[model samples]
Target chain A: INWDKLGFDYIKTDKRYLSYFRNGEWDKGTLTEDNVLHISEGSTALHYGQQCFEGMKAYRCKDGSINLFRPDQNALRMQRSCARLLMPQVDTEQFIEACKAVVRANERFIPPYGTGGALYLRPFVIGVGDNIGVRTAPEFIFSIFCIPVGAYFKGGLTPHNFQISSYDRAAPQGTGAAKVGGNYAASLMPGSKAKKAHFADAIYLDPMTHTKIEEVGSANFFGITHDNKFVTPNSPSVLPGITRLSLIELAKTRLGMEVVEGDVFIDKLSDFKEAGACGTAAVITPIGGIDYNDHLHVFHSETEVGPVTQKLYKELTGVQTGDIEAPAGWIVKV
Target chain B: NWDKLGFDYIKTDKRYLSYFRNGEWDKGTLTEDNVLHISEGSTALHYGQQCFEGMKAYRCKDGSINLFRPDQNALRMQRSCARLLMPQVDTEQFIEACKAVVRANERFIPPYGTGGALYLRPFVIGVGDNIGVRTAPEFIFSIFCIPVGAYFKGGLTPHNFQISSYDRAAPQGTGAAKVGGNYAASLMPGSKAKKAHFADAIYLDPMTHTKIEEVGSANFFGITHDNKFVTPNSPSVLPGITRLSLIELAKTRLGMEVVEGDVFIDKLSDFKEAGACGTAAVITPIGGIDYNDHLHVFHSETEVGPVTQKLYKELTGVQTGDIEAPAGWIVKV
Candidate 1:
């Protein structure tokens, strides 16, 4: 495999894991070669958006081993998303096992160590069956597929500009916390608009008041204050990102910095010296500036990454690749 | 079919299915198979890029079929398509397709005065193989039929609804559009309200959670003590055809003052009668609303209000072709 040139796109792997929830129970999952899904036209997943998904990566270590970062967290998050939409949940054990199985089956696709690439796993659950209405499906399917993806940002530690969007991804008391398809569906237009304006993505404000930051595209937003504090916005409308969670812990325990979870108001940008967007896909995209009210609020430098961002990226990538010690339960050897 | 047939899936003889690719929609065809084979990477499944319309065909007393204002449904669907970045289906194509489906399944149409009709579910979904949070490369617009009797309780019974803390759509999001995301966001809250023994939940405006935005899957209207017909007028609310028809009928036929404004939750006493309007069930007589540990009864809990009853009768009579409909309301098949 040409590991250096890999990008974030789908590649048909050797096998994928599939399971079905029917008759009040989930059947024993099996590896399948087929990638097409045959479902009923009346499936709720198609008409009512009864679906959720999780994204995580499997990194190839230097000693020919592989590391899976906090898959249990993904399993639990997927369960919450399912509960929000009334779909059946996959147990943590089953979820982690299925992910490992897919990784093993498609091990050849995993980029080599030091190439800044990994086997990205997408695990999702969808409602299927012959029924029309705004209700849960009679039957459900859970599947996992693997794709080899390079780091979301090709050149390492580069900065990107973002614009504040007038559109909200989800409502205040809606499925914002859940990893559901509707939240992303609400984001396509705004994301497209931001990209057309030559920005990386759009940043959303709180749904109630257009004051504080809610999300940076599909990821969570964070800022490194001048007082050496790592701060991220906390709200019910924000998705609880695992990458953001790791950074919070790393900043507090390893880097000896105070981590704060509070409102990061748009007008109060002067308190921070650096800012970034974080998620599993984007480990850390240093925010060069945020365009709002026809003014550019530049943080750090437009051409270079910040010091704190570089350190966080190194520590996180090191932990994933087995070069440095990870916190307990952070890494799972596959 | 039985007179008590409710809103449940009963597969009919044929359905209309069409494909949109190469930047143009093709001439549709009728199919019998109910299953759809699509790629695992379909955007509709992962990105929720889908929208649907609910409509019905009525069997008239003169041995003819009637489709109520299908062009309005088509126009609303076109708006939904634009909101979700999907291709628009013109009014001609939509009406012809609805007529074709109803004619193909003519026998499935319930007998006259059975209080039942052939319900049509026209949906547009993003399909084709891709792994991204973007619009689909290909699209599917399908219309399926199921013979149904009622959406809520039959016989124009009054039902109760509970005020929910959940928001069905966003403030500036796709709330105005008839898309799947808004419906998906309502499943939990709707189920919760049903579990509490209410017919459904009442959604409030997302930005400021004070005013009543909509009733469960329908638009809300009320009759005030001062004899004014009022319904919530907001961008986030779905512009229901039934609500619009009732508005027009109330103004022109019933001779009541029609008003489109916010029906504030705190101002429940201002309205003596309230009801929910949609394509399914026509109009559901709202008996009372439960909010903040108090039940504010509107119209009688045991009896339908005079205005609501009149509106329901007028709508149903016009739909079944028993009464002379307003000009351009009915499209015969």
Candidate 2:
């Protein structure tokens, strides 16, 4: 693999992990080379949006060992998502084992230790079976596929502009916290429109009262106060992002900065000195500006990344790559 | 195959399938395989990028088939596609495809006297090789068929429903469109009502919980104490076809004034008799609405109301070719 040229696009790999849940039990998952899925036309995932997915990565460390970052947390999140959507949950041990298997089956796709790239593992559970009603699927499929990617956006570590969409991604009491397909489905049109206007992606506001910031495209939004406080939006409609979770702990422990989970209103952009979007795909993209109501609101600067944002990115990426010390149970060796 | 019809899926002989690729649609085909082969990373699976239309084709009294207001279904499907950014199937192509599915599975069509018809499910799903949250590289629009029975097994029976605290669709989101997320949101609430011995769940407005929004998977209608026909209208409510037809029939045939406005939860006494209308049941009379530890009885606990019965008669008759329909109501297949 061309380590430096890898981008966030799906390339056919050698193998992927697949498992089936039938008769109220998940079978022993196996590694397979097939990428095409054969499911019934009446699968609930195809029509009723009864599906959930998780995004995690396997990193190659300098000690010739593969690293998986916080997979247990993802397993818990997937279970909660299944419960919300009324689908059966896979065992936590089974979830971790499937990830480990996929990593080994496609070990060659992992980027080198220093290329700023990793083997992006996408583990998803979908409602699959013959059905025609709006209920849970009779059967399910849990699979993990890996893709070698360098960056999600074009300019890594650089400031990118986002557009505030008039549309809301999820409702106040809807499936906003769950990592399901409907939240993303509501964003496709608004995101495409944002891209047309030369913005990075579409960020959303709360649905009930469209005043506070909800999310930055697919990522969670964070802003560093002028007094070195790290803060992110706190709303039931926002997905509890793992990267946001990691950064919160890192900011408090490693950098000795105070963190707060609360509302970040749209009209109060001047109160923060720096802002960025954080997620699995978007590791930490510095927000140069946000296009709102015929005006672009710049945070920190339009051409430079803030110092605190850079430090958070370094510490988080270091923890993932085994360069810096990680807390106990944070890294799983493969 | 036609004995004691109910709302369930049965594999018919043929189905209509068409694909959209390279910025255009292809010539459709009739397929027998009920299973669909698609890519693993399809947006429909990952991003919920899909929309579907539910309608039925009735066998008329003269041994002929009638598609009730196919244009309305086509128009709503177009609006749904536009809302979700999917390619819109032409109205002509949509009607033609439905006709093909109906004729291809003619044997599955239940007789006129039986309380069953050929249910048509026209759905559009995103497929092909992709892994992003954007639109799909390819799309499939298929019309599938199943011979089903009535939603209510016996005659028109009054059923009770419980009020749910869940929001089916967002206010400024895809609630007006017949997409999957709206139904997905109702799965838990509807399932809970079923286990609790209620017919289904009722939803209030997403913004303010005081106003009623939907009843189960259908639209809610109430006959006020003064014999007025009223149904809740909001931005997030799905404008159902049966609800639309009943409005026209209630105004012209029943000689009543129809008002489309909010039906508040606390003001349940304003409505004397209530019913739920959709493609499945036609009219499921609401016996009472249970909200917050108390049941609000409408006309009667276990009996259908007079106005509800008359409207049901006019609608079912028009649908099965017994009573004369409005201009451009029935499309001959």
Task: State TM-scores per candidate.
Answer: 0.98, 0.98
- Kindly list the per-residue Cα lDDT of model 2 for residues B145-198, writing each as its tens digit: 888776543457898999988888888778888888787788888898989989
Q: What are the Cα lDDT values of the candidates? A: 0.90, 0.89
Regions more than 4 Å wrong, model 2: B153-155
Best by lDDT: 1
Q: Kindly list the per-residue Cα lDDT of model 1 for residues B1-333, writing each as its tens digit.
A: 465688877788999999999999999999998888777788898999998998889999999889999999999999999878889999999999999999999988998888889989999988887776878899999999999886445557889999999999889888888888888899999999999999999998988878998899989999999989999988789888999999999999999999899889999999999999888888888999999989999978888888888898898999999999999999999
Model 1 chain A: weakest 10-residue lDDT segment is: A1-10
Using DockQ as the measure, the top candidate is 1
DockQ of 2: 0.76
Query: After best superposition, candidate 1 residue B184: deviation in angstroms?
Result: 1.6
Cα lDDT for residue B332, candidate 1: 92
DockQ of 1: 0.81
| Candidate 1 CAPRI assessment class | high
